[PDB]
Design a protein around this ligand. Structure first.
Ligand code: HEM
Ligand code: HEM
Ligand SMILES: [C-]#N
Ligand SMILES: [C-]#N
Ligand code: NA
Lengths: 127, 126
């Protein structure tokens, strides 16, 4: 954990400073409340098992930010290919992520930092 | 609370200045009495959970006035989007808020200061 990494003189990851796996679980749950109540986005998840998705997305986000847990889901490009997702849709999703993070009390400088890991992903996500 | 924040040498916020979460609860309560009695605004709130709206609006105001807790609701543009709210409507709402702050005993200078935090939010709301 964070304690073990500190004794190895490893720098503190984004994962660690926001609160590890438990913090990410709570953010992702609020994230999807937001995304599904947005009628610009809801129709994308019409045939989606949401419990399974939040499972994979907690895994993906935790790995992207420095966590030790493996991502067990499918490649980003493969999943989002041909779903008609534009940059408008990506930006709206990204916006709900920032909103979720803000609501969990994450400092805004750290949120900007997370958006910087996330923004490049649009290349695989969008059409 | 305010006592904790003064021992951390945080300057006094509008939130703590006007009386904290409890004082804003009382203001927002009287605020929507004024809004729902105004014929120019009443119809927007037909079929809305007022209890739930109150909770979110207290949370918003508290955070806009420099309080300790994050706003956890929806952004101002998204929530008010597609509702046809005009500057005339926003101004009536801000006037009702000013009048509730007055009734609560908040000094004129601090209401003016609160309206300076609020007024810019019209870009999003309208
Ligand atoms: C912001 C960057 C994004 C990340 C990090 C992300 C992450 C993920 C992950 C981990 C999965 C699960 C893959 C699997 O099942 O193996 C997934 C699936 C999915 N994504 Fe995203 N995603 C992003 C953006 C978007 C956007 C912008 C949309 C459209 C608005 C979208 C729509 C979907 C849908 C509908 C599924 C599930 C399909 C299904 O199985 O029903 N994603 N995403
Ligand atoms: C003074 C600036 C204003 C602030 C700070 C404000 C704040 C808020 C907040 C926090 C919410 C709830 C967001 C959520 O559910 O997550 C909301 C919703 C709403 N507001 Fe405002 N608002 C303002 C001005 C106005 C104006 C001018 C109108 C119309 C005349 C209006 C009418 C509404 C309506 C109809 C809702 C939706 C309630 C529902 O969920 O059905 N607000 N507002
Ligand atoms: C993926 N949402
Ligand atoms: C909300 N008013
Ligand atoms: Na509409």
């Amino acid at each position: 954990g964070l304690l073990s990494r500190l004794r190895k003189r490893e720098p503190i990851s984004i994962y660690d400073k926001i609160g590890g796996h438990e913090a990410i679980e709570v953010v992702v749950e609020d994230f999807y409340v937001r995304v599904l109540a947005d009628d610009q986005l809801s129709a994308f998840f019409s045939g989606t098992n949401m419990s399974r998705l939040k499972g994979k997305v907690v895994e993906f986000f935790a790995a992207a930010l420095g966590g030790p847990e493996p991502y067990t889901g499918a490649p980003m490009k493969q999943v989002h290919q041909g779903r008609g997702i534009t940059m408008h849709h990506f930006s709206l999703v990204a916006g709900h992520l920032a909103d979720a993070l803000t609501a969990a009390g994450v400092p805004s400088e750290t949120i900007t930092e997370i958006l910087g890991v996330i923004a490049p992903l649009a290349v695989d996500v969008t059409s």
